[PDB]
């Protein structure tokens, strides 16, 4: 059967009984840093069972006329376990992830989600002169919602969150060039994505630079007849892979 | 004192030239290369991925996510029409802005086949068959199911495998076709009709939606790189 997976990382395990395939990045599996491309000159810390495991983020409700969500994945993990304690005592660090969005419904519901993973998603502000503040770009493991109307220019520092432009200025239909999967409630129940380290420097700081973005956008909205269960939640389960850090200092 | 003789074309600045030129920083040392994932070697790798097509514009949906969804009901008659658009991937406003039309509008000629993947985004107990036709030009639009069955078609049954792929072939007199609208090199029409109904059980919603994707086959090609009309400037930024 091509419909069952079993992923094992560290001391955790994800079981699935109704899935699609597994989309692997840009054809690349995450590996450690080689000796050709390294630029730092002291021995890195590789915990590799303390950090590489499945951290489960918070749940969000899929309402009947909803818009979308985004987590800012690089430091979505910042307050989770021993991934968030090496992120502070160190200066550098590289990672790759294994994102597993899971949302289930019966055989009488209908809908469709798009689960992308957008590297370097620079967001636009509502007021044209300013740039959005930190609290509006990323919430610490809490989803930030899109809006099916548009945000006016009276708001000084807020992200422009119209869904049909995806907040970056591009069309929302063309987001299928990034590695992506659909959660069609007719056939699918979850979506797996294995992302390598995509950046222009061999190691980057973990608090000033969010090098991904995970967006869930419902292209076909939820619907059900009167009687079915109206609360359909969505859970994201992110796990780092082949994590290493460098340059120890005080706590920040 | 070698005798030379300067031809026409001397001391001109052509923007698409290929010459050498003295370096402004001698004996520089570049920063060594790194294996960043996801390298583009050719622009026809970008125009061979699927992108969602706004088949449902109608002036109220283009400022929404409703523009991508094609509405499909449960009817009381047979042979109705679901959608229809002409196959002009550079000038028709349906395929104007997808990932294929944003690349063809940099070039002038194009040649090849085009895939069209539909996906039934409905309930798990809804059934039905659709006919996906494509009629080459010469006559008008097909207006019946009898007039559209005579072209190129494929009858799609909705089951466990949700999606079905209509592959529009390359039938043309010339070796290329213009990106801009021209009636000398028109390409045809793509329609879609109910074969049978959409039959649902009790307590299942009847209004189901259908998405549509577009891409290019392994023999698509472009020519004569030009400028794009989808951008505009007044002063500097």
């Amino acid at each position: 059967s091509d419909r069952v997976r079993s992923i094992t990382l560290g001391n955790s395990t994800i079981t699935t009984q109704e899935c699609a395939n597994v989309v692997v990045g840009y054809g690349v599996w995450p590996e450690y840093l080689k000796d050709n491309e390294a630029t730092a000159e002291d021995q890195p810390t590789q915990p590799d069972v303390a950090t590489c495991r499945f951290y489960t983020l918070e749940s969000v409700q899929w309402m009947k006329n909803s818009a979308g969500w985004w987590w800012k994945l690089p430091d979505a993990l910042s307050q989770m376990g021993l991934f968030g304690q090496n992120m502070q005592y160190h200066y550098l660090g590289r990672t790759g992830y294994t994102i597993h969005v899971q949302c289930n419904a019966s055989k009488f519901h209908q809908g469709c989600l798009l689960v992308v993973c957008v590297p370097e998603a620079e967001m636009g502000c509502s007021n044209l002169n300013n740039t959005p503040e930190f609290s509006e770009l990323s919430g610490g493991d809490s989803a930030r919602m899109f809006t099916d109307t548009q945000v006016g220019e009276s708001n000084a520092k807020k992200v422009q969150t119209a869904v049909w432009n995806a907040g970056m200025g591009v069309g929302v239909g063309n987001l299928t060039i990034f590695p992506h999967q659909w959660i069609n409630l007719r056939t699918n129940n979850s979506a797996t994505l294995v992302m390598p380290y995509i950046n222009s420097v061999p190691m980057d700081n973990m608090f000033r630079h969010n090098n991904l973005t995970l967006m869930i956008i419902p292209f076909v909205p939820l619907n059900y007849s009167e009687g079915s269960s109206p609360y359909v939640p969505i859970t994201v389960t992110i796990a780092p892979m082949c994590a290493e850090y460098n340059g120890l200092r005080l706590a920040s | 004192g070698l005798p030379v003789m300067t031809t026409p074309g001397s001391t001109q600045f052509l923007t698409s030239d290929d010459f050498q030129s003295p370096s402004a920083m001698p004996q520089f040392d570049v920063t060594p290369e790194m294996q960043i994932p996801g390298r583009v070697n050719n622009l026809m790798e970008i125009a061979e991925v699927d992108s969602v097509v706004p088949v449902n514009n109608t002036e109220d949906n283009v400022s929404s996510l409703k523009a991508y969804q094609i509405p499909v009901q449960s009817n009381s008659d047979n042979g109705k029409q679901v959608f229809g658009f002409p196959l002009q991937p550079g000038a028709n406003n349906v395929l104007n802005r997808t990932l294929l039309g944003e690349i063809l509008n940099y070039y002038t000629h194009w040649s090849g086949s085009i895939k069209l993947t539909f996906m039934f985004c409905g309930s798990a107990m809804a059934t039905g068959k659709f006919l996906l036709a494509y009629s080459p030009p010469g006559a008008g639009v097909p207006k019946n199911r009898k007039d559209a069955m005579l072209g190129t078609h494929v009858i799609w049954d909705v089951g466990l495998q949700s999606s079905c792929v209509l592959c529009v072939p390359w039938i043309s007199q010339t070796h290329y076709r213009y990106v801009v609208e021209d009636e000398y090199t028109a390409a045809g029409y793509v329609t879609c009709w109910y074969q049978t109904n959409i039959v649902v059980p009790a307590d299942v919603q009847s209004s189901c939606d259908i998405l549509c994707f577009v891409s290019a086959c392994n023999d698509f090609s472009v020519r004569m790189l030009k400028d794009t009309p989808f951008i505009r400037q007044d002063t500097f930024y």
Partner: antibody
Amino acid sequence: EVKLVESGGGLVQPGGSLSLSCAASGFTFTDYYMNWVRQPSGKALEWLGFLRNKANGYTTEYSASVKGRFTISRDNSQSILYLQMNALRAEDSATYYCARSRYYGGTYRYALDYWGQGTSVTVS
Amino acid sequence: NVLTQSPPIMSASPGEKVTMTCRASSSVSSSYLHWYQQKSGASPKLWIYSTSNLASGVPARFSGSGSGTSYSLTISSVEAEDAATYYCQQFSGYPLTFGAGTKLELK
């Protein structure tokens, strides 16, 4: 049937505050956008701001002239909607309405279908 | 974006066909222009949404049209029931501006 009754208007001094309240009945309060429109005596209608539904996150969006002085919010338990007015001037004497919005197709056209009866504020 | 309605006051006898307008300074989308009717001393009411679609319970005599920056409302037969003031609404950017008003005076 939709039934919107608002209350809380009256005489007030310039430089003072006043809180209007609009109560909703007949529909689910967490599904629809809720607007606030005022109208001076025999003049044009003026839009003050709305407050989005639960699925878009209850954010607000004010006008250009009342931004920072007025505040739109609701109560968590029962179906009611507020408006807190601050630093009132002489031109704020008008009739204040409480309008509803809805989705017509699947999208959101910006109409205001069901209106309230209108409360009055006189500032002098 | 300021809406300008013309005429400010108008008069028509029952049985006539009368047409008012609402012209914007910049182009609005056709799905964002709406028409309202406020009678004398009462709360307003939605009349036409998205420039050609009739609201609920409205008579079939009213019909709006137009596109671009010129929009219009057309009454085929005037009765004594529709003597009121008609506003037009828009949206191109925030805020949503209402029109001045066209008062229908019965003859």
